[PDB]
Amino acid sequence: LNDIDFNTYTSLEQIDKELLTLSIGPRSKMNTLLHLDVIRKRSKPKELPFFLQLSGEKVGDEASVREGIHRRDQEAQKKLDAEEQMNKFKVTGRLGFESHFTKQLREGSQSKDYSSLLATLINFSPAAVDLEIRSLNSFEPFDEIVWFIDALTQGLKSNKNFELYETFMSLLFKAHGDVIHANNKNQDIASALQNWEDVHKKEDRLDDLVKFCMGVAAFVTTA
Amino acid sequence: VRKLKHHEQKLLKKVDFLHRDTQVMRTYHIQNREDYHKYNRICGDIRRLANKLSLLPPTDPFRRKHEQLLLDKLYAMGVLTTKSKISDLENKVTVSAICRRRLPVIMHRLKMAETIQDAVKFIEQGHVRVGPNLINDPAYLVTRNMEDYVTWVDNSKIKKTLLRYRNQIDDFDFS
Amino acid sequence: YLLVTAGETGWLKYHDVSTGQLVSELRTKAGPTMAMAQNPWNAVMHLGHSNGTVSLWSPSMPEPLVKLLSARGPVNSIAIDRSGYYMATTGADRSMKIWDI
C-alpha cells in the first residue's frame, strides 16, 4: 500500500511461472545480437626496383610473343602487417588464465545450477556476448557446449528473458553449428538437445497466440 | 588631395588611394557599391563556368547535360528569356539584366510605384507581397513565376486608396 | 608612407598606403609576434617573439636584419628611444632589459 500512499506503482518482474517474460530492457538488443556480425562488416572504415623485368609484348619483342613462353606477395605483406600490430601491442600486465565467464560456467557445471551464469550472461554487453559465444571450445568431450546447452535449457525453464535465451541459442547454432552437426548423434549432445527441444515444443503456444491475435485484428479492422 | 599642380602631377601621376558603379547607382538605383560588385562577380562566375565547360570536351554527355542544367536554371531565374543559345549566355548576362530583375524595378515596369525610390520606400514600409508572404528587403531578385504573382499586401492604406479612387472598395474583404 | 601589420599567423606585411600596393610580405618562422615597435632613427621594425628574441626586419629582404635574445619566455613589449639608440624590452618572466641598439 506504500505504492498507494505514494500514488506510484512499479511493474512486476514476472506475473507467474507459466507466463513468458522478456528481458527488462531495450527491444533493440535482440536485433543487435542477431545481426551483430554484419554490423561489424558494414562499420569497418573505408581504407621502384632498379632492375625492371618487362615482357616481350610490352617492349618490342613480338618474336618472344609469337613463341610466347603477386597475390603470394600480398599474402606475405599481410602476414607482415599482422606481425606489426602483434608486436606493437606489448602490454605485459598480469591477467588471469581463465576468463570470468568460462570460470563461472565451470563451477555452474560443478554445482549443476547455472543461475549466476545466466545472470552474468544477461548483464553482458552485446559485443561481449558474441565474443564469448564465438570463443567457446569444441574439443572431443564437448563439455563446454553441453554445459552451455544445459544453462540455456535451465533458463527457458525459468521462463524469464525468453527472447535473449532464444537468441543466445541461435547465436550458438550460428557459430558452432558446424561442430554440433558434425558430431551429431553423440549421445551427450543428443540428450542435451533433446531436453532443449522438449522445453521448446512446450513453449510454441506463443506462436499460436500471436497468429490468432494478428488474424482477428486485421479481420476486424479492415472488414 | 589638393588637385595637385602640373609638375607634381608629372612626378606623382598615380598617388590616389582615395564609374559604372555610380552610373547604375543613378540609372536603376541599386542599393550599394558592394551590391554592384556582387553583380559583377556573379557575371564573372557565369563567364568562367562557360569557359571551363567549353574546355570540357564538347562531345560529352556530362558536359552537355550540365550545360542544359545551367541554362535552364538561369532561364527560370529570369535573367534571360531565350533558351536556344550559349553565346547568349556569354554575352547578354549583364549587371543590367540582373538589376532590371531586381524587385523595385519589377514593381516599376509592372507599375506598382511610379519611381524606383518610391518602390524601395514601399518595400521598407511593408506593403508588397510575393505569393503568400511579404517582402521587406528590396535586393530581392524575383523568379519568373513569382514576379508574375507579385501584388500588394492586404488591408494596406495603399490598396485602400487605390480602390477608393476606383470607387471599387469592398469592406467585406476589409480591403 | 608605410603601414606595417604584424599579427598572429606570424607574418609581417608592408603596405604602401599612398599608392596602395602591398610592398612586402615576410613570413616569420618564429610564431605569433608578441610585441612590435619601430626604430624611427632607422625605420626598422623590431618584432618581439615568443622565444624571447627581438628581431629587426626591413621591407627589402626576407630574412631578419638581426636577432637579439632579450629574455626567456615571451617578450611582452618593446619600446625604442626617439634617437633609436636605446631600447627597453619587457618579458613575461618578470624581466626587463635596457639595450644599446
Binding site: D3, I4, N7, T8, Y9, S11, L12, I15, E18, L19, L20, T21, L22, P26, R27, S28, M30, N31, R40, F162, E163, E166, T167, M169, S170, F173, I180, H181, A182, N183, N184, K185, L193, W196, E197, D204, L206, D207, L209, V210, C213, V216, A217, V220, T221 | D72, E124, Q125, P132, N133, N136, N145, Y149, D154, D173 | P32, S50, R72, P74, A92
Partner: protein, 792 residues
Amino acid sequence: KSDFKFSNLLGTVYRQGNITFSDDGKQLLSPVGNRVSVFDLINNKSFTFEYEHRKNIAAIDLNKQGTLLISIDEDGRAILVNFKARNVLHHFNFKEKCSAVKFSPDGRLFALASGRFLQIWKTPDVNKDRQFAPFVRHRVHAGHFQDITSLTWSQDSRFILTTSKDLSAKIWSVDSEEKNLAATTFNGHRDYVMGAFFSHDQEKIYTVSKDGAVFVWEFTKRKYSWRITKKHFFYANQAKVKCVTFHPATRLLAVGFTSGEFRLYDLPDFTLIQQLSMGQNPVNTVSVNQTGEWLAFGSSKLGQLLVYEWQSESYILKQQGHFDSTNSLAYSPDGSRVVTASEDGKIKVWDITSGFCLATFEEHTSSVTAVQFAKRGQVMFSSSLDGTVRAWDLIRYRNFRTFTGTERIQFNCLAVDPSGEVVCAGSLDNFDIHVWSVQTGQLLDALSGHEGPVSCLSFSQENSVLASASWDKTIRIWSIFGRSQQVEPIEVYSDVLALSMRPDGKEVAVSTLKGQISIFNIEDAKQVGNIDCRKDIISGRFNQDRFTAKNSERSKFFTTIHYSFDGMAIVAGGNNNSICLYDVPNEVLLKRFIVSRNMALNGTLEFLNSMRPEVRVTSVQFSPTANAFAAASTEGLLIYSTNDTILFDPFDLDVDVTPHSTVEALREKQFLNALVMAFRLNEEYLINKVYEAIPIKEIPLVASNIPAIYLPRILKFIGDFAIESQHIEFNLIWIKALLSASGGYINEHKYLFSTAMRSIQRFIVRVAKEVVNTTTDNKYTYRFLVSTDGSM
C-alpha cells in the same frame, strides 16, 4: 488530451559547444541550439530538456554526483537545473562571455573560465530548499594576458590548470597555503596552448599545444622546479589541434584536429593507438567516459556527433543531424518511424522509440518539398524541386522509381492513393496536377482546371477522392476512378494554402490567407464551419523591420494544418512563432505553444529590447498513436507528447470510488468491478496495479463483461502498455480475450477504435512477430541439425 509537454527534439544531435558524459557513463549530454539533449546509451533512448535559453548554449557541465547541471549561454546567462526531477532551480548572470565550465570532482565548487579571468564559485546545495540567491564567489584570479582557452581540475579537488592564448599554462591552487605551494606558471611554448592535464600521480604535467606539440613537465632536479622532461610532436601537414582530452587513469590522450582527423595516443610512452578521419570539417569537441572506454566526438559544421569505443572499435552511435532546415515531415502508418526531408534533399528515416537515425537517402538533388507514406508499411514517396517524384521502399531501403513530368517541373505538393496505386503531384510552374501510376510508371495524365499554382493535395481514404486546393482562391474535389472523371469546384474567400482531410473521409479543412480555417463537407460541397485565427497568433518582430509585430501580416496565417485521429482536433502552424491547437466541432482553440524563445532567431522578440535565421514551422502532423505530435521547424523536429499523464482526469466518478475502495475490491475478488473503478478514476498507476493483479483463469469473464463505454480506453491502454512491457502473453491473452468477447462491436464502429487497433497491431507486428520469428528459426535449425546425417 489537450495537454502536451515538449518531450523530444529530433535532428541536430549537436550544434555548438561542450559535449559531456554522465557520471555512470551511461548518458551523453549534448547542447543543441537552445536546449540540451540527453542520449541514454545502454537503454537506447533519448530525451530533451524542456527549458530553453535566450541564445545558443556555449558550455555545459554535469556535477559528478549526477545531480546538478549548469549550462551557460554566450552572455554569462547561466541556468542551474536538477536532473532527478528535470526542473530549473536558479538562473544567474555571469556578466562576461563564459568560455568553459567545470565542476570540481569533489562537487563542492565549480570553476569558470571567462575571458582572461578565472572565477571560482561554490555550488548550491540541492537538498536545500529553493533559496533566493544561492550563488557565492570563492575566488577570482587574473594572472593571464589573453583569453583562458581551456581548463582542468586535479583528481584531488585542490588544483586547477588553466591554458591561455598567452601561450601559457598556469597552476592555481584552491587554498592560500597551497597557493604558496604551487601558484606556478608554464611558459616556453609555440603557437597556442589547448590543454593541460595532471598525470595520475600528479608529479607530471602535460601541456598540449595548437601547433601539435606535447610537453611533459615533471617536477625534477637540475632548489629545483618543473623541467620540460620530454617533447613529443604530432605531425599533421597543416592541421592544427582543435580540442584535446586526457583520461588519466588509463593515460589516454584523444586529440581532434581541424582537418577532421582525430588521434588516440597512449601518453607517457606516447604511442599512436589509432587515427581516424570523421570528415572534411574540424573536430570540435571531445570527451571521455570515466572508465576510459567510450569517446565522444562532436563536429559542428554538419552537426555530427559520434560515440566510439576504441577498445573494441565499435560505434555506439554515429548520428548526423540535418544541415539546413527540416522542410517536411511524415509519420509511419503505425507510428514507429518518422521521415523528414531537408532543404538539401537529405531524406532521413528516424526511429521514435529510440530517437535515432535509422537511415538517410541522398538520391534527390534539390530541396525536397513534401514527403508522404501510403496506407501501408511498404512504401514512401517524396517530392522535390528537382522535378521528380521519387518512390522509395522501406524494407529494402531503395528507390522503386523516379516519376517525372516532361519539362523537369518542380513539385510543391504530393498525395498518394490509399491503394498505393496512383501518385499525384502538384507543381507551381504549371498548376496541373500530374498523375502517375505506381506499377506502370508512366504518368497517366494531367488533371487540369485550376489557374494559378496548385497549393496542396490530399486523398479521402474512404471514398478515395482527392481535394486539390490552389491560390485560385479555390478548392477542387476530383473523383478520378471509374469512367467518370468528375470535378466539383468550391470557392473560398482567399488564397487557400493548406489542406487536410478527416480520417473518416467526409470533410476537408483548408487554411486560407486571411487566417481562417474553413471546414467543408465534401459530398454536399458545402461549408460546415470556419475558425478564425488572426488574433491568437504570436508573430515575431524583425530587427531589420520599420514597423511593429502586430500590425504586419508577416505570418498572420497558417501554412500547415492537420487533423487528429478522432477527427476532433486540429494542429496548425505557419511562418509565425506559434503552434495553435484548435478543435473542429466547437470552433475554438484548446492550446497555443510557442515554438522557441531564442532572440537569435529573427521573429522571436515581440518588442525589441532597446538575411538572418527566422523561426517558422514548415510542417506539422499528429501522431497515428495520438499521444503526441511533431512540428518540423527551422530548428529541427520538435515532438510534444502526453506520455507524462501527471493529471487527474477522472470520468463519471462517484463518492464511493476511491483508490482504497479499488484495493478493497481486489481483496474481495470482484475483478470486473475493480477494473471499472480503476478506469473511472483514470489513473495510470491504479490501472496498472489492478490490471496486473487479476488472474488468468478469470481474464475471459472480465473481457466478456467490460462495458462498451470502456472498450476503447482499455484497448488503447493495453496497446500503449504492451509496447514497453515484458509480460507478453499476459498482454496477448488480454487482447485475444478482448477481441473474442467484443469483436462485432468493434467491426460496427471501426472508426471509433481506429487508434486502439492501430496500437494493438503495432505491438503485435513490431514486437511479437519478431520473437516468434526467432523462435521459428531456432526450431527449424534444431530440426535440421539433428535430423540430417552427420558429416564424413
